[PDB]
Structures are given as structure tokens and as C-alpha cells.
From a paper:
We found that pre-incubation of fungal laccases with certain organic solvents significantly increased their activity toward both phenolic and non-phenolic substrates.
We also crystalized acetone-pre-incubated DLac to investigate whether the protein was modified or bonded by acetone molecules. DLac after 1-day acetone-pre-incubation was prepared for crystallization. At the crystallization stage, the crystal-growth time was 2, 9 and 20 days with pre-incubated acetone concentration 30%, 20% and 0%, respectively, which suggests that acetone may accelerate DLac crystallization. The space group was changed to P43212, different from the orthorhombic form of P212121. Thus, this immediately reversible enhancement was due to neither chemical modification nor covalent binding with solvent molecules. Here, DLac, with a broader substrate-binding cavity, showed higher organic-solvent enhancement than TvLac (3-fold vs 1.5-fold).
Author numbering: 2 to 495
Write the structure that this text describes.
Amino acid sequence: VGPVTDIHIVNKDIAPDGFSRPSVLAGGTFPGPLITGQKGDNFKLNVVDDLTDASMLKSTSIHWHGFFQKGTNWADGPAFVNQCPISTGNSFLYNFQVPDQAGTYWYHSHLSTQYCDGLRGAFVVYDPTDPHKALYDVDDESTVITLADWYHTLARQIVGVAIADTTLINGLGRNTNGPADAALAVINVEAGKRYRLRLVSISCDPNYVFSIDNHDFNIIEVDGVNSKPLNVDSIQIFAGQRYSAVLNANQPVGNYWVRANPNLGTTGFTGGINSAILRYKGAPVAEPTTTQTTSTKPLQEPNLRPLVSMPVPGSATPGGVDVVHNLILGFSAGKFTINGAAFTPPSVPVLLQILSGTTNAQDLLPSGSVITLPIGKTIELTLAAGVLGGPHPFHLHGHNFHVVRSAGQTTPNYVDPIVRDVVNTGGTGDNVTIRFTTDNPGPWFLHCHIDWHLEAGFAVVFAEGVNQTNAANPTPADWNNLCNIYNALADGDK
Ligand SMILES: *[C@@H]1O[C@H](CO)[C@@H](O[C@@H]2O[C@H](CO)[C@@H](O)[C@H](O)[C@H]2NC(C)=O)[C@H](O)[C@H]1NC(C)=O
Ligand SMILES: *[C@@H]1O[C@H](CO)[C@@H](O)[C@H](O)[C@H]1NC(C)=O
Ligand SMILES: [Cu+2]
Ligand SMILES: [Cu+2]
Ligand SMILES: [Cu+2]
Ligand SMILES: [Cu+2]
């Protein structure tokens, strides 16, 4: 569907691994419908909130992950940063353009932990003059592969640490204690053809080590950014990351296991959990018998290079930028913290605070969780790891960033590091460093993409170009009324 479409947000009981539970779904499916368009399109995505189950929230808001939203900050999605939520029985039109981006993206609820309850799907923007197009034969709905964590317990009823119950690949998977006749996803190929696999993590938490028995890949895209082709045989993919990986169907006609091994919950592949099937045309309709061969060329982020020269902003030394924030990532008193502050949402969305006249840095709410950035400047952030519950994949809205230092990398790369929008911060001893330029007025979230951690405070808002935000982001009438509608709701109807 798309670029112009209604998207109904509904409650439905579903059982993707055989266990039935209530859910919040775009288009009544898990994952939601694939949204598509072409580079340069105007997306007009009319989100119709038909939710009735208070246990997963009747309100909603959708984030279109990876899009810059230049001049449409109001459409970015995060509840109480960029909008008040959409209220049940109402619609809201996300109306934005994608002039300068093409690649593999996704969308998800950005209200509390609601995307874990099912509101997530893939979003692909095709490039009619894609520089990589001659490297593959097939690129369509059938080559999108979503990796999802699935919980038997509703997000708002979770007790203690959330642990995914089942891995779902294209919405299908087996649970370790579930029916073994539960359907496995099948990726269909024909011998001799080449496939652009668009691998999308729609995870609320775990990372996945992705592989296909007896096959390898050339990575050609990273979080929307074209890369030099990189030959790999396994891909660790963190929450919200995307890769395009070209697969050549060059093995004998048969069935081959597709493997997505999570870092938490039940790991491995006993009984066909954490698995899907690559089936060549002409093979029996049956489960694979193939063996996981050792990974001789796993993806390492420092090996990724942009296809086109993307010069690193600033100078080639630590702190060689206009603005440095060495962010202190911590945990105390039951909450995650950035520079000592746990994010909790304000009653007035940050964008509305600014648009209504609050332009002094000290007055923006929540106090301690908003950092103003001046417009037209080079920025360096460090995200030194060690804090519990990792590895934490950090995400910056409104921007891509250069990963000048990856997890596990000591010496920064100021020449040709990859540019992306979700980065693994790693563990103790890592000091992930990212750079970008402030070219996009408005408030933009920076947070851990483990949704449980965002809920527990692991976020900060960058109010970029506060005094340019009003001129840059004219708002539509329906956005202007969201807070009035939402604040009028009874507490049981939120
Ligand atoms: C992560 O790297 C940054 C450099 O990019 C370190 O920042 C320096 O920290 C020291 C000690 O606090 C300061 O005296 C320097 O002024 C900082 N340099 C810059 C350029 O800002 C940071 O300490 C590193 N973090 C960890 C945990 O190793
Ligand atoms: C915006 O401009 C006003 C008026 O000059 C000033 O008081 C304020 O500090 C500016 N805000 C930021 C975040 O630069
Ligand atoms: Cu996201
Ligand atoms: Cu995002
Ligand atoms: Cu986290
Ligand atoms: Cu976000």
C-alpha cells in the first residue's frame, strides 16, 4: 500500500505461534501492511484509530523510522515530543515528502510500549535509478524479511524484565513450548536468480544473528544508505536496523534453513524455532535438513563503507566539531538515565511548547531531558557503554549519522565510516562516537531502541534550531487539534 492510503489501527486476537492474545495492528495483520513508494513521493498516510481495548491503549501515534521529516517535524510520531496521540474514533493524516531518501525503512507505534503489542511493519522506498539495480533480478514484497520479537504477555501487563517468547520471521514462527505444526515462513527463490533481501528488524528488544544455510550475501544498503557491496555470511541486526543483502540462488535446488538467533529468550533452533525456510522452485514442500556451517565472514560495522563519498563533518580528531556532547548513559532508582536524567513525557508535546512561544532552553520540558542544538553546526555525540541491560542500540530521529567509532573499534575513522540511523553501543570499554550536521530544525528524539528501556527513561530530546523551528515546520489543522481532543478523553479511553 502507499504512497497514498488509509491505515486502520485495530484490535484483533492473533496467534502467530499458536498462542492467542489481543493485539494492536495496522491493517489487522502482524506485521502490518508493507508501505511502499518511490523516491520523491509525497506520502499521505491517513491513520484511522479504531482501537477499543484500554489494556493496550486506545490512543496511538506512528513513527516512520528513518525519514528526515525536514519541514514536517509534526509528522515524526513520538508521543509528547512531536505530537499528542491520535484518539480513538479519530483519524490523523501524516503528510510528508521523501525527496532525497530511498531504501529500506519501517514504521511503528511511538506511544509508550504499544509497538510491542503489534503495531509495526516495513516501509520500502524504491529508487527508479538505483545504482545497485543491476546487482539483482528480484526486489519486491516477496524479498522483504521482517524479524520480530513476540510476547505472550501484553506489554503493559509485563512483570519484571521483558523476555521475548518467540521469534517471528515475516510474522511466522514456532515457540519452544508451542504447536510444532505452527507455520514457518517461506522465502521462494528460483535457481540462478539474485534477490535483494530487505532485512528489517522490527524488534522491541533482541538483536538477531541472521544467516541462511549454504548461502552468503553482499550487503548493499545500511539503514537507507547505499553501501559499497560487502560480502558476508552472517549479519547481526539490532533493534530497528535494516540491511539490503543480495542473495544469489546458486545452490542446488532444495530447502535451506533461514536462521535468526536472538541474544535473549530461547536461543538456537531446536524444533525449528528461530527459523524460516528458503525454498527453491522444484524442491519438495518440506522442512530443510541443512547444516549451519561456521560463519567465516560475519558482518562487522567498521567494514561497511558508503557507496558515494559522504565526508565526515568536522575535523579528524576527537572533539573536532562545533558542539560535543559526551553523553553519560546510566541507570539508577529503577530508571535509565542520560546525563543523570530519566525521560518522562511532558503534558504539552515538545514541538507544541516551542511553536507556542517557549524558545528559552531552560524553560523546555521535561527539565533535564531537552538539549538545544544550534542550527548549521557540526555535532559529535559519544555514547560510552557499560550501563546494564545492553547492548543498547541507539537511534537518532530526523538524521543519519556517521559512525566514526563503532562498538569494538578503538581508532576512529574520519575518512569513510558508514552512515546510518541505529547504532549498537556495545559494552564496557566501547565508546561509540557519531557525528552529524544540524540541517533540520525541530525537536528530535535520541533513545535506546529497546522499547522497554525507552519506557524506563533512556532518552533525551535534541531541540535543534529552536528559533528556526516555527518557520521550518508549518502545521496542519488536524495536528493543531490533537492535544485538545486527547486531553478531553476520560482516563479509561486513553
Ligand atoms: C569517549 O570518548 C571521548 C572523546 O571522544 C572522551 O571525552 C574526553 O573525556 C575526558 C575525560 O572526561 C575529557 O577530559 C576530554 O575533554 C574529553 N574529550 C573530548 C574531545 O570531549 C570520553 O571520556 C570517552 N568516554 C569513555 C568512557 O572512555
Ligand atoms: C531563541 O532566541 C531568543 C531571543 O533572542 C533567545 O532568548 C533564546 O535563547 C534563543 N533560544 C535558543 C535555544 O537558542
Ligand atoms: Cu524506530
Ligand atoms: Cu526513528
Ligand atoms: Cu537499551
Ligand atoms: Cu524513536
